[PDB]
């Protein structure tokens, strides 16, 4: 499987690096998409190479989507192409993993009304206003959508997402 | 004229300091309310003293409210007492100034349905989902609510807010 | 009303941003002059665009001068052209606002003998040795010269400077 | 199964956080041991709670050992008790995972003579002088010892370590 | 000989550490005096232990004085006791070494009128207004006063100061 | 006399700057060699110009060698040319000063068997495994090799090294 990550500068470092390596362990191919080629730097200073830009992503070529948190989702959600990628993959029923501020991209895509999930508690009212049935749990699984809240939930977040990709 | 500020650590420094001094120029008494007494530190490292805690605020004692941005509103909006202060003052028709992420507190208060305003563009979809008629302008004035987007709007933000307090 | 600012990297962020927006509120045109075009960054990391270089400034084209503090004045005062701009505008009786280390430029211009004002207390002995009658006050107004000491004085500093430009 | 981590301040953040969550996914109990109770902070600023001090560790109570990298191993290897824990667990054939500078603790334990493994390439000559058959590979498995070199190897490092704990 | 250093937080790190070790090489005893006991931290993050406070210094007990630069001299020069120590030792003809912003303390002591020396070029006009015959040289020796400008002058600064202490 | 320094980014700032100026005081020519031309930055942010690259160094042209510490030696010791320079100069009996992690380069050169010296205590076991008779002292002098442990030893380190160059 080809797993796409939508992110940008000021991503929450462990929320990108943890699923990146956890999914590589399974033999899945992992791709970082962002605004431009080169590198992006997390809140804590970890640097990662960008594999492709949002403009070059064909959503049909990717099988699963991961949305790390941090401050990057508020930048990503203003890019119409990045939001279109998330709208298409999520609405087609492809596996989507979000954590922390990651689901702000799904709010902007207009795909969460009636869906059950979680997020960083600081944006729960925004998830509720987007029609989410918000749950305070380390991991929520709602069909193709696997959601978690904070870095302390990483173990449970990918435990459930890896099951979805099997 | 007693102006209350609702804020916390990681406030956007100039969005707190600019209205604080602009309103002191007019002879208004300015008060910083936060989670605990002592000091709070902005994103850029400026420190300010907390005058009172959210639990000690009686909203009837304050005439106007300022909501600076940064990452502080996502912490403030999880405090039921801080949200109740903003709900009471805004719903009473008292002057309320918000900028950048500041209106996340008003979203949580449930007072923005059908109101017209702006915010940091990164949360415009959350403002729209809360019932705001969102406008991309340096300053919007909707009755008692004066809203702006980013630090570049400071001059226009307080130019309009000062007129409401006269 | 064209207001010129003489500054450089490591300016005290709020001492530049506060008067910039306060004077824009009045409808005055504000200009940042520095060593080179592009951007300059304050002590706390705020970035601002440089409008023109010291070499391109014709002091006859500007009506008032603002001298923010920080570590920038110690760099600015070594530039003969920047010091000549401050000498000409101050000695012509045009309104000049200084705060914190800002008057180090006026010391270098040789215009403060027998004038009354203030500064960051750490350089009061240097102001006294330049012939200033130094006062420990949040704001001092001596004809065209409006001086303040530290960021806590911002409200009083521009309250008096705005009156001079009216 | 109880997994012990030996670490200190300036640990490489992802080298501690990644195996911590990867092993919690399997249902293993994970324990952070360091010099004192309270918290320790990684090179990149992530902070983690210390579960117990080196003096309180009884090696017989733990089933497996993880040695993250960063600058922490050079501090840990000067603590005779921490080195004795690593010596006892490694020499008893319990699973031991090391990455980056992590095996400096095993060098100090005197247990690597005639063993095959890897490390951060910057200390390969020190591993060779301790009697290691050094291999430049993302992961090496030598009986109970699973070793990796850098953060890019995380996926392979725990892929092999998890197999040892099954 | 007992060499006293007058300094505080935000000292220029190499300007304190270099003379400290260079004078210890000669067998001189070296003492750091500051506002309070404990430690002080330089601009670049080096930490040094404070040996005694300004209040506990008896200038008669010290044979030579060193004044490092950085931002510390602007804090030190506001302390009447620290300025009195520098006034007494300098006016008694004891060896005094200054570099960079270090001579701001001697300006405040009122001992430089007619003396020949140098400093950080950014404060040369303040040295001139204090009556200094200012020279642009890596090191100036004027009787008991050895002065230098910047970190690049360290080699020449202590080359001359060590000769004075022989 | 020409003194060569082998170093890189993340050198311990005072361990490079202190011997650089101490040896310039004696009139010796000092040269910084690193991976590329331009500048290198220490752990604490001091920046120094690189005089020449490792590939351009002819060991016959230099009379003495300095090896500062920090994290730079673990990068330098992976460059076969930099290790060959240290090997050639040390094995020819030219004066060699090392401090802290600096002797990791000599370990990699294979020249320390049966030699007496010291280092940062965190790598003493690696020095012992390289055949060093390790001593816990502020300075050790073994023929041409002058070694010290930490920044607190600077005064003693160059006191002994300067005697070798006379
Ligand atoms: Tb940011
Ligand atoms: Tb934060
Ligand atoms: Tb600076
Ligand atoms: Tb460190
Ligand atoms: Tb052997
Ligand atoms: Tb400072
Ligand atoms: Tb590093
Ligand atoms: Tb042997």
User: Which CATH number belongs to the domain containing residue D23 in this structure?
Assistant: 3.40.50.880
From the list E24, E156, E159, the residue facing F155 with the nearest CB is E24
Find where tokens 């970035």 sit: C47
**Residue C66: both structure tokens together:** 């603002």
3-state secondary structure of D11: strand
Q: Is B28 left (phi over 0), alpha (psi -120 to 50) or beta?
A: beta
Interface B:F, ≥3 CB–CB pairs < 8 Å? no
Spell out a b/e string for D55-85, using b for 16 or more CB atoms within 10 Å of the CB, else e.
Answer: eebebeebebbbbbbbbbbbbbbebeebbeb
Q: Is D154 within 8 Å of A21 when comparing Cβ atoms?
A: yes
From the list A77, A104, A125, the residue facing B108 with the nearest CB is A125
User: Cα angle vertex B14, ends B11, B20, to 5°?
Assistant: 90
Residue D51 contacts F, CB cutoff 8 Å = no
DSSP string, F39-50: EEE-TTS-EEEE
Which helix (H) or strand (E) segment is F125 a member of?
A: helix F124-129
> How many angstroms separate the CA atoms of E52 and D12, rounded?
38
Which helix (H) or strand (E) segment is E91 a member of?
A: helix E80-91
Residue E130 contacts C, CB cutoff 8 Å = yes
Cβ neighbourhood burial of F113 (10 Å; 0-12, 13-18, 19+)? exposed
CA distances from B54 to B13, B79, D166 (A): 20, 8, 52
Residue D163 contacts A, CB cutoff 8 Å = no
Q: Is C151 left (phi over 0), alpha (psi -120 to 50) or beta?
A: alpha
> How many angstroms separate the CA atoms of F78 and F59, rounded?
18
**Residue D137: both structure tokens together:** 């590979």
- The β-bridge partners of C40 are C48
Residue D138 contacts F, CB cutoff 8 Å = no
Distance from the alpha carbon of residue F147 to the mean position of ligand 2, in angstroms: 43
The active-site residue out of A21, A28, A44, A100 is A100
Classify the C-alpha dihedral B18-B21-B23-B26 as positive or negative.
negative
Distance from the alpha carbon of residue F93 to the mean position of ligand 5, in angstroms: 25
A165 touches A1 (CB < 8 A): yes
CA distance B108 to chain A (A): 6
Residue C46's closest chain B neighbor by CA?
A: B44
> How many angstroms separate the CA atoms of E111 and E132, rounded?
10
How many domains does chain F fold into? 1
**Residue E10: both structure tokens together:** 């935000």
Q: HEC string of chain A?
A: CEEEEECCCCECHHHHHHHHHHHHHCCCEEEEEECCCEEEECCCCCEEEECEECCCCCHHHCCEEEECCECHHHHHCCCHHHHHHHHHHHHCCCCEEEECCCCHHHHHHCCCCCCEECCCHHHHHHHHHCCCEECCCCCEEECCEEEECCHHHHHHHHHHHHHHHC
Count of beta carbons in the 10 Å neighbourhood of residue F152: 12
DSSP assignment letter at B155: H
CA distances from C139 to C142, C151, E10 (A): 10, 11, 28
Active site annotation includes D100: yes
D46 touches D29 (CB < 8 A): no
Distance from the alpha carbon of residue C52 to the mean position of ligand 5, in angstroms: 68
Distance from the alpha carbon of residue F115 to the mean position of ligand 4, in angstroms: 29
Residue F106 contacts D, CB cutoff 8 Å = no
A108 touches A123 (CB < 8 A): no
Residue A49's closest chain D neighbor by CA?
A: D152
Distance from the alpha carbon of residue D129 to the mean position of ligand 5, in angstroms: 7
3-state secondary structure of D78: coil
From the list E18, E44, E156, the residue facing F45 with the nearest CB is E44
Taking the CA of E46 as reference, the closest ligand is 4
Structural domain containing residue B133: 1-166
Interface D:E, ≥3 CB–CB pairs < 8 Å? no
B70 touches B22 (CB < 8 A): no
> How many angstroms separate the CA atoms of D77 and D73, rounded?
6
Residues contacting F127, CB < 8 A, separation 6+? F103, F107, F112, F117, F118, F119, F134
Classify the C-alpha dihedral E62-E67-E71-E73 as positive or negative.
positive
Taking the CA of F129 as reference, the closest ligand is 8
**Residue B75: both structure tokens together:** 């912490």
CA distance B131 to chain C (A): 30
Contact list in C for residue B151 (CB cut-off 8 A) is: 17, 46
- The β-bridge partners of E3 are E30, E64
> How many angstroms separate the CA atoms of F132 and B12, rounded?
55
Residue E93 contacts C, CB cutoff 8 Å = no
- The β-bridge partners of B98 are B67, B147
């Amino acid at each position: 499987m080809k797993v796409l990550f939508l992110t940008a500068n000021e991503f929450e470092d462990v929320e990108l690096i943890y699923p990146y390596h956890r999914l590589k362990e399974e033999g899945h191919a992992v791709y970082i998409a962002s605004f431009e080629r080169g590198t992006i730097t997390g809140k804590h200073g970890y640097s990662v190479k960008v594999d492709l830009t949002f403009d070059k992503v064909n959503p049909a070529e990717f099988d699963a989507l991961v949305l790390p948190g941090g401050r990057a989702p508020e930048r990503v959600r203003l890019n119409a192409k990045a939001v279109s990628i998330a709208r298409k993959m999520f609405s087609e029923g492809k596996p989507v993993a979000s954590i922390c501020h990651g689901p702000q991209i799904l709010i902007s895509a207009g795909v969460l009304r009636g869906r059950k999930g979680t997020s960083y508690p600081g944006i729960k009212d925004d998830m509720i206003n987007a029609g989410v049935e918000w749950v305070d749990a380390e991991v929520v699984v709602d069909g193709n959508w696997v959601s978690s809240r904070v870095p302390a939930d990483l173990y449970a977040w990918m435990r459930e997402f890896v099951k979805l990709l099997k």
